[PDB]
Amino acid sequence: RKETYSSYIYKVLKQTHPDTGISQKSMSILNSFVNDIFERIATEASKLAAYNKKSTISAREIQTAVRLILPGELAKHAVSEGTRAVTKYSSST
Amino acid sequence: KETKEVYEGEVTELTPEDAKTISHVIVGLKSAKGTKTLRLDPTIYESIQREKVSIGDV
């Protein structure tokens, strides 16, 4: 069960460019890019958790790490979309 | 010689009662100088229902 992100980026490509296909080398580009971003953001969040005598990683540390990693317009759009997703998930009532 | 009598304002209550034929309709009207309730004919209730009048219209 070798695990990869192929199906998910296949659909989010399919909701905006329906008549377009992906090559396998390109498929690997997006897979490696997603894994690299995940690794960078997660190790920065762990470093910031170890900053403050804190043994728990929560959403605030990842928000600070996103504001640290990304450039500014990407950062403000990422925290806007992530905050909307968190408020969608939390108000599941 | 004629006379003109007008009720106008915002609807605050629209409660009809039957006996499947409606007997009378109590309509409450509201303006800036106060409020006033009325009794109404079933034909005027049909005319109200034709105009798609709900609570909060003028």
């Binding site: - | 209550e13 106060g34 409020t35 006033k36």
Partner: protein
């Protein structure tokens, strides 16, 4: 001219105390434990003899190494001892009772009381509506243990003021009280407060001043001076009023003719051939300017207008290139991929498709110099009134950024009516509660056996005797707004009477004095020592001026 605000001036004369000769150990003594002020005085007077803020400092002297204690008006003597004053309250409740015990000792000393094994006088005390059991337990404990008082009664200050203005004790009316930390609506039937129908809004003067402070902090983020709580209290007391109709006043609050009269400005306190050809061209231009100044000035104005249009087009192009989602960026990407997917002219096109961030700035500087030369040739031969933001900060006058006095100015245009509106619309302050008029409407039109459309006799008597009390009723325009709303939702021809005293902050103590002077109905409210020893601290005395039991 902008008025200058500062701290309020300090008191000079210290607080005096009454003579011990006039004290008698049988008269009752009334104490109004308020969140903002303390009101105490003997029963036989009409006004209280001691009014001071509810505050306490633990003063520390570096030289004498002694912990001092300044209470109330004695804290209004130094700036340092004013700034470090602490209240026993935390929100609508009392947390630390040592401060209250010290303050009670201070006010017992200042009343000229000579005691023996505690205070012999019975006390009159106020309490919050539907108070927590811990509060009355602690009050019973501290009174009946540390002070040996024979009699205690508890009541709400709103009902005390209602009894002051209706001394018969059996009238029917509606009470609206705007306190320091909350606002209550209590209906009264036959002199007895119907506490199963009272309502409370979590908003008071304290939240209003904090709201004004937050609005001023958000409005001027680069203000160089830090403002205190007392300064914001003075701005709230001086230039805030209730609008007659808030729904239409905000549409015309920022017009130019309205801002001429309804704007307040507040000042913070502070302490060779080419050279020959150029000379010939200059001489010809001077001869043309001396010969036909009008035509040369018109041509120079046309050239300046063309230069300004070219500069505006260049700035529009520079702004359009900055948008990644614009069609210009898509055309740039199409040309770039056209040089990356599939001659001297195509070579010049590839040279012309290069990024020019600093070249555009240099060309803009050259165009600005050309426009300056065109303006100089026109001389030789952006309005702030359309800016809502400029009217919002700096009012109807032009603004100088270099002025040191204008750097400390503060304008109050929308905040004069926005701050007092929260008691009518509590959602603006963040409380999901109904307003004053909504609660009064659902009390009068759907309770006490009143169907919507006709009023019972109890509701008619309630409408005919509306009383407004509380310390936060000092805001102008409140009574007219409540009268307008009340005649808005009531049936026509209903008589509306709204009563407000001259000082609505001292009617509660006058209610205590009027109840204590009336001997007959006094004894229904007093709680003896034997009563507390028999039924314990879990005991509620049901009477017409106080709290009721929690259950049925």
């Amino acid at each position: 001219k902008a008025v200058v605000i500062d701290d309020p001036p300090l008191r000079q004369t210290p607080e005096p105390f009454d003579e011990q000769s006039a004290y008698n150990p049988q008269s009752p003594i009334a104490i109004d434990f308020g969140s903002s002020k303390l009101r105490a005085g003997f029963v036989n007077h009409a006004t209280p003899t001691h009014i001071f803020p509810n505050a306490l400092t633990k003063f520390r002297d570096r030289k004498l190494n002694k912990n001092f204690t300044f209470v109330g008006n004695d804290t209004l003597l130094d700036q340092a001892v004013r700034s470090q004053s602490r209240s026993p309250f935390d929100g609508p409740f009392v947390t630390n009772w040592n401060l209250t015990e010290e303050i009670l000792d201070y006010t017992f000393h200042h009343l000229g009381v000579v005691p023996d094994n505690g205070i012999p006088n019975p006390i009159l005390l106020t309490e919050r509506l539907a108070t927590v059991q811990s509060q009355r337990t602690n009050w019973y404990q501290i009174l009946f243990e540390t002070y040996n008082v024979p009699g205690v009664t508890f009541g709400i200050d709103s009902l005390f003021s209602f009894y002051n203005y209706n001394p018969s004790g059996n009238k029917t009316g509606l009470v609206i009280s705007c306190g320091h930390e909350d606002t209550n609506v209590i209906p009264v039937v036959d002199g007895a407060g119907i506490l199963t129908d009272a309502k409370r809004i979590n908003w008071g003067g304290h939240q209003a001043v904090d709201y004004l402070n937050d609005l001023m902090a958000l409005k001027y983020p680069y203000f160089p001076t830090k403002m205190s709580y007392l300064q914001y209290e003075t701005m709230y007391k001086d230039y805030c009023y209730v609008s007659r109709n808030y729904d239409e006043d905000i549409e015309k609050i920022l017009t130019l003719e309205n801002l001429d009269t309804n704007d307040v400005v507040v000042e913070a306190p502070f302490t060779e051939r080419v050279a020959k050809e150029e000379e010939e061209k200059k001489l010809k231009e001077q001869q043309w300017r001396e010969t036909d100044l009008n035509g040369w000035i018109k041509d120079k104005r046309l050239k300046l207008n063309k230069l300004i249009k070219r500069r505006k087009e260049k700035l529009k192009l520079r702004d359009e290139m900055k948008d990644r989602k614009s069609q210009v960026s898509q055309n740039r990407m199409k040309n770039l991929a056209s040089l990356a997917e599939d001659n001297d002219e195509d070579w010049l096109i590839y040279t012309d498709i290069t990024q020019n961030p600093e070249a555009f700035e240099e060309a803009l500087e050259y165009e600005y110099k050309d426009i300056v030369e065109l303006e100089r040739l026109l001389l030789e031969h952006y309005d702030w009134r359309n800016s809502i933001l400029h009217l919002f900060l700096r009012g109807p006058r032009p603004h100088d950024s270099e002025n040191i006095h204008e750097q400390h100015q503060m304008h109050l245009n929308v905040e004069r009516i926005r701050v007092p509106e929260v008691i009518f619309q509590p959602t603006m302050g963040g409380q999901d509660q109904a307003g004053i008029c909504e609660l009064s409407e659902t009390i009068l039109l759907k309770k006490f056996g009143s169907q919507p459309g006709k009023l019972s006799q109890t509701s008619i008597d309630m409408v005919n005797n509306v009383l407004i009390t509380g310390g936060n009723a000092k805001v102008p325009g409140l009574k007219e707004r409540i009268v307008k709303e009340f005649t808005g939702f009531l049936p026509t021809g209903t008589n509306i009477t709204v009563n407000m005293s001259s000082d609505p902050s001292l009617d509660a103590w006058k209610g205590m004095a009027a109840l204590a002077r009336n001997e007959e109905q006094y004894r229904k409210t007093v709680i003896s020592k034997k009563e507390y020893e028999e039924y314990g601290p879990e005991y509620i005395k049901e009477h017409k001026l106080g709290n009721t039991k929690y259950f049925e």
